[PDB]
């Protein structure tokens, strides 16, 4: 039995003290002239290479001085600090060299720690770099994660400097995969070309291999003429092998072309009584209802946000204590292919129904019950999508509840009962814009074009605001029925303003129908009526947002018409 | 803080290396037994190996060291503790464990075995432990041995190891003012028999041992007996002791200051900040001496006084950290001199108001509202005062609540509302006894001679039912004459070889009055033995208990409280 | 010759002068988020000082006195009362300045 109370801590601390005082040392590591007198026992324990270094009978087993090369001394001191105390304390810059030295020394625990740290830090730019790093040092978890991140982002960037310097096998795996998040088939073609234009006459065979990989759909466009311009002289059989890649090799449709603009819904009426709420989706064009997996599977009252790059995030929320609703500041992100939710850096305050707004690539969480007891309650907190951290910003002018916030013209706009403040995204200047003549709450707003459409409130209030004009005006009243309960939802659909409303009467069933609204007509034309045979009841606390999803990755929601 | 995960990983990897013998460079050669180990672990654990390897001598460099004057098993257990931290300590090898720990100067194992020995000190190894603490310098063990040896040995003075003791240790023991003896002559004869263990090896110490005993026995008998055992023609001792007993004026010791007193627990706290306190009444000094508070204000407990005059506390509940109370099975022992409660081995099950009864040296706790509450919730358990452990006994056939128990004729007699069962320690069985004709509860009984006197019962009353063990029958004697329209609080106890009663009565719109009566056994009448004046004794409460015991007025202090 | 009205419901520092007959603000005493500050203003050794205690959620009270300057409008750190000698006081406690005898009085026993 390992008694952790007395001996373990005391033994570890005394070993660390002996290391500090250079006591009972019998082995010293020479690293480019730097001396590291650590002790044989702890070396052989942590590392799986030092045990063979000191146990296997050779000339270095009986050697007081050992000249170990190809290892960094700063990283080696970090390793020996982790070896005398159990604490790694890794930064964000020296992770690559630390992992390389750990792999060379075969230290499993620090290898796993660095693997987890790297798999948690594939943010935006090191994706291709760490993918190449994992290709050099075999790491299945890192390889798969970096491959997915590359298939997600490089398909939208395809210009990274590090991407040019890649091995043939990794590039073939990337290109031949059917996970390319590209809505068009020419971008991958030009990416492959530019990968084969900066290094030509050196990778001509690999040029032919990538040419075959990109396949006929993009091979029949321009590649022949560009290659004729750039081919080496006196090349004949290369023409023969290039001409062959027209008929064969199974031309098939890709997966990134299925970016159907749909609607993501949360907190729906769960089918099985064992579950409370569920997240589902609706297809405006396919006229189908898809489902999504709950991010925590137990926590509710979350807020949604969609970046211009079509990303889904979940922040805040409350979960039942399950003693024998507590608020959690956790954060999550939705995977567009794996149909799962990977968590991210949690917030600093446990918010209830936060309002997340994206601007300048930053996620801004406005209001939503930060803590309540916090003296400064009229406050906000934003997110960094690149650095993966939360930065405090200028607080709210006035404290508001059940508010809504949108982004227009790269500027933060938050709407409340009657007031509105514009927060300069860069100058952090909360300046009052205009005040509504009607006091309505429990409503949301949509940022369509350059006009904010605040719909609903307690109703059918249609108050249109323009940034360039800075004024509030009414347009019309949405066609509703007598004694109805219009749950209004305003959102952009296919670059056209539309609404999604549900009416409820006494002893009557709910009806779902979306209307097409015109700017100059001030009328909501009947666009499409959602049939109850495909979509069932949603509820009251459901939320709506616009985003593109994959039908194959998701699954249809089974429900009897 | 230091990462505990990496610490335990390092420790288990080092222990794996030790078991597999990979990086061992130094081998300990003890009586032909190989002990392959490392230098780092030995240096970290022991303070002798750090001076053995970091010295610069022959054995410091020799990969083979012949460690002598040690034991193989002790060295093995020390090494395995240094490699994994587990110290399996039994009741036999602790002596050699301490010997090797002192030889190797390992502080952790030394402290662990010191704690084990401070817990293991008892009557049958008191002198041996004191000699061991004299051989190896250990002040804590020496002081605990001093106290326990003084008390138990002055009670017993028959240990075989007492003969083989150093002169300085005996001088310290005999000259101390903490000895517990009813008379000053038993120590005299103990010293005489120790001196007569040898003849000439004790002659030089004869002049010193008599210098610590009072001269009241240095001129009476046991001076010619030494002359009988004197070496022949020795004229430097007879005439020496003839004119030597001028100094050392007779001073009474502390052991002769024990008086029959009534110990009270859970009394009404004079200070309102405290919840319940403990006081004591002096039937002879006519005063109220304060007592130490129960351990962690342990309420709802039971008391017992062994024939050796020892006080114990078992069961009870502590307020959990408005009503809030949690029951704990902690056990404690009261120090008659230090005025403190020394913790002992806790019980197996928690109890509320347990009946502690002593018999054949075993402490019996019958019932007491156990948390178990099973089919046989009437399970009783005895305590071993020799091995310091608890052992279950035959369960009580019937489940009883608010019961009392006494010991008569080497048997346990537990009493309930109307039934009685006698437990036979020899056969571990229960036998049906006589049935009472009155249903009374919440009363106490005192065992005087071979009779059981169940006094009171239900407030209480003046009903008395006397039971005879030899006759096996319940008979009435009389009713205690008390003031009408009152609620007396009867307390049966044995004192001065007679059955007296501690009955506190309260009248209407009047304060409680304290008075004790002497019950005439042959005349069947309660006679006024003494009236307790209210100028010294204040209110105690209702849930207070009383017991018969002896205490030292010198060690205790008078309670400062207004009449 | 100046009245220093401190606190109120906070850290309001309103200084009044008899010869000038006007109320003015000087500065704010350093207070943290949700720090219940029991301000106490009193004269110490012919120098204006304050005795304040801060309380947070799931946190222990801290006692510290600061030295305030008239022309600086700042409460310089004069002395921090260690909890090893002084324990918690409460909410309705009062403070006043006076001279006493140490021999006649007795030290308050309390575990650090």
Curated annotation (Swiss-Prot), chain C:
Kelch repeats: 2-43, 49-95
Coiled coil regions, renumbered to chain: none
Disulfide linkage: none
Record text about domains: Recognizes the BCR (BTB-CUL3-RBX1) E3 ubiquitin ligase complex substrate, PIK3R1, through the 4 tandem C-terminal Kelch domains.
Subunit annotation: Component of the BCR(KBTBD2) E3 ubiquitin ligase complex, at least composed of CUL3, KBTBD2 and RBX1. Interacts (via the BTB domain) with CUL3.
Function text: Substrate-specific adapter of a BCR (BTB-CUL3-RBX1) E3 ubiquitin ligase complex that acts as a regulator of the insulin signaling pathway, modulating insulin sensitivity by limiting PIK3R1/p85alpha abundance in adipocytes. Targets PIK3R1, the regulatory subunit of phosphatidylinositol 3-kinase (PI3K), for 'Lys-48'-linked polyubiquitination and proteasome-mediated degradation.
Protein name (record): Kelch repeat and BTB domain-containing protein 2
Organism: Homo sapiens (Human)
Gene: KBTBD2
């Amino acid at each position: 039995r390992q008694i952790n109370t007395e001996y373990a801590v005391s033994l570890l601390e005394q070993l660390k003290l002996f290391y500090e005082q250079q006591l009972f040392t019998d082995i010293v590591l020479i690293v480019e002239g730097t001396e590291f007198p650590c002790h044989k026992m702890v070396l052989a324990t942590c590392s799986s290479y030092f045990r063979a270094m000191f146990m296997s009978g050779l000339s270095e087993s009986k050697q007081t001085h050992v000249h170990l090369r190809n290892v960094d001394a700063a990283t080696l001191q970090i390793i020996i600090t982790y070896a005398y105390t159990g604490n790694l304390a890794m930064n964000d810059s020296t992770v690559e060299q630390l992992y390389e030295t750990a792999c060379f020394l075969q230290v499993e625990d620090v290898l796993q720690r660095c693997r987890e740290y790297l798999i948690k830090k594939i943010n935006a730019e090191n994706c291709v770099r760490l993918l190449s790093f994992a290709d050099l040092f075999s790491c299945e978890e890192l390889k798969q994660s970096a491959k997915r991140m590359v298939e997600h982002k490089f398909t939208a960037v395809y210009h990274q400097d590090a991407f040019m310097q890649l091995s043939h096998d990794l590039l073939i795996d990337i290109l031949s995969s059917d996970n390319l998040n590209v809505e068009k088939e020419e971008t991958v073609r030009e990416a492959a070309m530019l990968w084969l234009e900066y290094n030509t006459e050196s990778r001509s065979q690999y040029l032919s291999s990538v040419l075959s990989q990109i396949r006929i759909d993009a091979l029949s466009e321009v590649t022949q003429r560009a290659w004729f311009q750039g081919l080496p002289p006196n090349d004949k059989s290369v023409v023969v092998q290039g001409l062959y890649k027209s008929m064969p090799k199974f031309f098939k449709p890709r997966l990134g072309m299925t970016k159907e603009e749909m609607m993501i819904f949360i907190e729906a009426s769960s089918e099985n009584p064992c579950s409370l709420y569920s997240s589902v989706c609706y297809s405006p064009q396919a006229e189908k209802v898809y489902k999504l997996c709950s991010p925590p599977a137990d926590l509710h009252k979350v807020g949604t946000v969609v970046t211009p790059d079509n990303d889904i995030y979940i922040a805040g929320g409350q979960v039942p204590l399950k003693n024998t609703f507590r608020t959690v500041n956790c954060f999550y992100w939705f995977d567009a292919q794996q149909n799962t939710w990977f968590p991210k850096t949690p917030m600093l305050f446990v918010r209830i129904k936060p309002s997340l707004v994206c601007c300048e690539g930053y996620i801004y969480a406005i209001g939503g019950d930060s803590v309540g007891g916090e003296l400064n309650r009229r406050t906000v907190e934003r997110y960094d999508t690149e650095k993966d951290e939360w930065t405090m910003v200028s607080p709210l002018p006035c404290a508001w509840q059940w508010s809504a916030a949108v982004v227009v013209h790269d500027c933060i706009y938050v709407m409340t009962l009657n007031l509105m403040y514009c927060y300069f995204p860069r100058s952090d200047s909360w300046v009052e814009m205009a005040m509504r003549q009607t006091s309505r709450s429990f409503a949301s707003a949509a940022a369509f074009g350059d006009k904010i459409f605040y719909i609903g409130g307690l109703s059918v209030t249609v108050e249109i605001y323009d940034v360039n004009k800075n004024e509030w005006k009414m347009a019309a009243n949405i066609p509703a029925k007598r004694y109805s309960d219009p749950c209004v939802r305003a959102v952009v659909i296919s670059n056209s303003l539309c609404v999604f409303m549900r009416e409820t009467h006494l002893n009557e069933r709910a009806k779902y129908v979306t209307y097409q609204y015109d700017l100059e007509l001030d009328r909501w034309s009947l666009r499409q009526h959602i049939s109850e045979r495909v979509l069932w009841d949603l509820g009251r606390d459901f939320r709506c947002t616009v985003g593109k999803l994959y039908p194959s990755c998701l699954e249809e929601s089974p429900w009897k018409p």
